[PDB]
Amino acid sequence: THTVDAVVIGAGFGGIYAVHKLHHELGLTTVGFDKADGPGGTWYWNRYPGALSDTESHLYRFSFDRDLLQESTWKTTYITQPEILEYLEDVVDRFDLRRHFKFGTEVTSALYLDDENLWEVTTDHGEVYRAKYVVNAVGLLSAINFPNLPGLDTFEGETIHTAAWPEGKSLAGRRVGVIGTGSTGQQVITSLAPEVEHLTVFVRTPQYSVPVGNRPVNPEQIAEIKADYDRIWERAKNSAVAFGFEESTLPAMSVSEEERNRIFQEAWDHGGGFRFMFGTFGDIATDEAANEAAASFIRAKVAEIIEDPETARKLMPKGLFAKRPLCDSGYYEVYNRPNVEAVAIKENPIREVTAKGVVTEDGVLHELDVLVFATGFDAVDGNYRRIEIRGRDGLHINDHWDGQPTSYLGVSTANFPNWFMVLGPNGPFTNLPPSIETQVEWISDTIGYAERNGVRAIEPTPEAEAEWTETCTEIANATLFTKLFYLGGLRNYRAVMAEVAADGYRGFEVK
Numbered sequence: 001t002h003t004v005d006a007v008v009i010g011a012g013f014g015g016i017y018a019v020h021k022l023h024h025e026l027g028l029t030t031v032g033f034d035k036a037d038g039p040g041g042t043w044y045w046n047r048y049p050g051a052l053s054d055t056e057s058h059l060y061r062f063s064f065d066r067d068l069l070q071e072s073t074w075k076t077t078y079i080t081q082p083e084i085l086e087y088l089e090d091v092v093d094r095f096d097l098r099r100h101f102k103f104g105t106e107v108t109s110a111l112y113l114d115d116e117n118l119w120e121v122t123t124d125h126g127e128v129y130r131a132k133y134v135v136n137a138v139g140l141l142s143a144i145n146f147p148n149l150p151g152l153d154t155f156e157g158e159t160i161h162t163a164a165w166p167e168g169k170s171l172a173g174r175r176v177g178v179i180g181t182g183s184t185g186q187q188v189i190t191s192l193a194p195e196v197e198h199l200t201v202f203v204r205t206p207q208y209s210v211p212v213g214n215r216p217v218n219p220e221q222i223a224e225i226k227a228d229y230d231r232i233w234e235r236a237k238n239s240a241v242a243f244g245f246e247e248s249t250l251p252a253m254s255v256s257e258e259e260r261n262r263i264f265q266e267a268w269d270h271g272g273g274f275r276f277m278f279g280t281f282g283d284i285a286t287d288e289a290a291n292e293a294a295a296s297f298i299r300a301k302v303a304e305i306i307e308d309p310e311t312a313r314k315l316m317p318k319g320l321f322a323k324r325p326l327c328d329s330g331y332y333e334v335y336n337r338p339n340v341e342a343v344a345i346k347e348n349p350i351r352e353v354t355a356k357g358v359v360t361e362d363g364v365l366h367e368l369d370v371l372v373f374a375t376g377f378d379a380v381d382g383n384y385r386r387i388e389i390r391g392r393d394g395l396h397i398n399d400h401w402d403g404q405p406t407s408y409l410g411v412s413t414a415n416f417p418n419w420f421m422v423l424g425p426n427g428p429f430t431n432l433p434p435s436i437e438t439q440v441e442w443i444s445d446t447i448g449y450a451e452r453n454g455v456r457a458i459e460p461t462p463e464a465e466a467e468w469t470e471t472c473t474e475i476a477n478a479t480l481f482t483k484l485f486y487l488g489g490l491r492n493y494r495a496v497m498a499e500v501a502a503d504g505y506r507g508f509e510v511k
């Protein structure tokens with residue numbers, strides 16, 4: 001039953017930096033915690049085949065330490081999970097942090113003590129920590145999502161969730177079904193297709209995907225990037241999404257059918273999902289006609305790629321190109337293989353799982369040895385809403401988030417003092433690490449200020465939280481995503497966080 005200045009929940013990008021900042025800049029005694037048996041967070045857990053970043057390799061990392069940027073290396077233009085995981089372990093060892101982290105250790109309640117003005121925090125190892133500050137780096141993701149299919153437990157084969165992939169497991173020569181065609185699904189599908197005896201993909205909503213263009217690089221290309229890194233990060237910190245391309249301000253309809261498609265083809269060829277949505281035109285997300293053009297281009301690629309038309313149509317993405325854009329390493333092409341079958345489960349849904357496989361409503365048994373669920377997770381809400389987290393006067397987090405989850409500035413919420421969030425709700429939608437730094441940096445300032453000036457407790461007003469929900473909402477419904485995040489872009493997000501701090505923490509009850 002110990003007592004410290006600060007607790008950090010989680011050891012991915014966000015939890016790792018927060019420890020570094022709170023211990024080494026602000027001198028605070030600081031303990032880190034993670035269920036996981038080591039660091040990496042998202043990348044400790046997802047070791048499924050083909051797991052790859054959407055963010056180019058040079059930019060999906062910390063920026064804050066200039067020696068590190070010069071010494072780290074990568075193989076391709078996008079970075080794989082082993083390589084990311086490895087990088088976070090180098091980072092963890094480089095800044096001397098293993099020793100602040102209790103691994104294999106779940107934080108299971110967070111009681112705020114109104115009279116001691118402290119947070120009482122308990123582990124599944126029995127321990128208790130009493131801390132003045134809590135920093136939640138629990139991520140945008142929550143519990144694995146895992147639809148309970150009828151008869152599932154009759155299945156005599158192995159079932160695997162993408163995020164619980166057994167290290168070392170091979171599906172080579174097995175008959176495998178995959179459910180889900182999200183970002184994970186496309187990846188695990190491209191990578192499985194060539195090795196398995198047969199692949200059945202259960203598609204519910206086919207999505208829009210552009211080539212990822214993941215190319216090999218030589219040490220000289222890296223060294224041209226290394227030489228220009230102050231400008232790269234300054235540029236990225238001053239863009240909206242920080243994916244490393246200039247963001248277009250050219251309206252789609254402001255140029256010609258041929259020009260429009262010329263631009264859409266160079267982007268296709270160059271590769272990159274965000275690059276397609278935002279590197280090409282500036283209104284794809286905000287003008288109806290801009291959007292339809294982008295979407296149409298992609299469907300023509302799909303009909304150019306899938307030879308058999310009954311298959312093509314099952315994989316044909318429909319309607320607004322207003323989900324997060326995917327990119328792949330040859331996804332549509334997989335459906336030309338004789339040992340891949342597509343099952344459109346809107347038209348022909350799963351009726352049940354039986355001993356030997358999956359049965360659809362048409363009454364065909366799809367014989368499977370392995371059923372892989374690429375069905376994702378259950379939202380930000382989920383990693384908080386699954387705990388004894390209570391704020392002032394014992395108020396429960398799930399009681400406090402009576403409806404949609406909320407925050408002020410993506411890092412805080414009313415009735416939860418000295419309690420912060422890294423990637424809480426209504427935060428930025430960007431290449432995450434640069435946003436994680438913004439958040440951790442602001443959180444570490446705020447906490448340095450609190451100690452230096454003798455602040456007992458800080459928390460936002462419910463007035464302010466609601467003003468933020470409105471700002472996020474007004475900006476959302478100006479885009480085609482409407483038809484959970486602040487969508488004004490990193491640069492605006494940074495000026496806002498900075499103004500609030502320069503303005504004496506406006507929207508915050510300081511005690």
Ligand SMILES: Cc1cc2nc3c(=O)[nH]c(=O)nc-3n(C[C@H](O)[C@H](O)[C@H](O)COP(=O)(O)OP(=O)(O)OC[C@H]3O[C@@H](n4cnc5c(N)ncnc54)[C@H](O)[C@@H]3O)c2cc1C
Pocket residue numbers: 009010011012013014015033034035036040041042043044046051052053054055060105106107108137138139140141184383387422423430431432433436
């Ligand atoms: C396959 C995949 C690819 C991705 N690619 C990209 C990309 O290219 N670009 C991008 O910007 N984003 C990407 N993301 C999103 C990605 O999660 C973020 O970029 C980033 O990893 C977030 O890191 P984090 O430290 O904030 O949270 P996480 O890495 O999610 O770490 C959170 C940790 O909190 C822990 N935790 C939660 N509750 C508790 C508790 N009660 N006790 C102890 N521990 C707890 C979890 O175990 C977890 O390890 C991807 C995600 C996935 C799954």
Ligand SMILES: NC(=O)c1ccc[n+]([C@@H]2O[C@H](COP(=O)([O-])OP(=O)(O)OC[C@H]3O[C@@H](n4cnc5c(N)ncnc54)[C@H](OP(=O)(O)O)[C@@H]3O)[C@@H](O)[C@H]2O)c1
Pocket residue numbers: 052053054055147162179180181182183184185204205324374375376377
């Ligand atoms: N950038 C990257 O390289 C990368 C890679 C992987 C993951 N990620 C991130 O991590 C998050 C998770 O991605 P993800 O692909 O694991 O999950 P996801 O985006 O949530 O994809 C979910 C998939 O499962 C399907 N699905 C869900 N429940 C189902 C059910 N009961 N029956 C049939 N199908 C079902 C969905 O279909 P519907 O859509 O019709 O519901 C969808 O195809 C994403 O937000 C993504 O940004 C990023």
Ligand SMILES: O=C1CCCCCO1
Pocket residue numbers: 054055429430431432
């Ligand atoms: O591409 C991504 C994946 C996670 C969602 C926001 C970050 O950007």
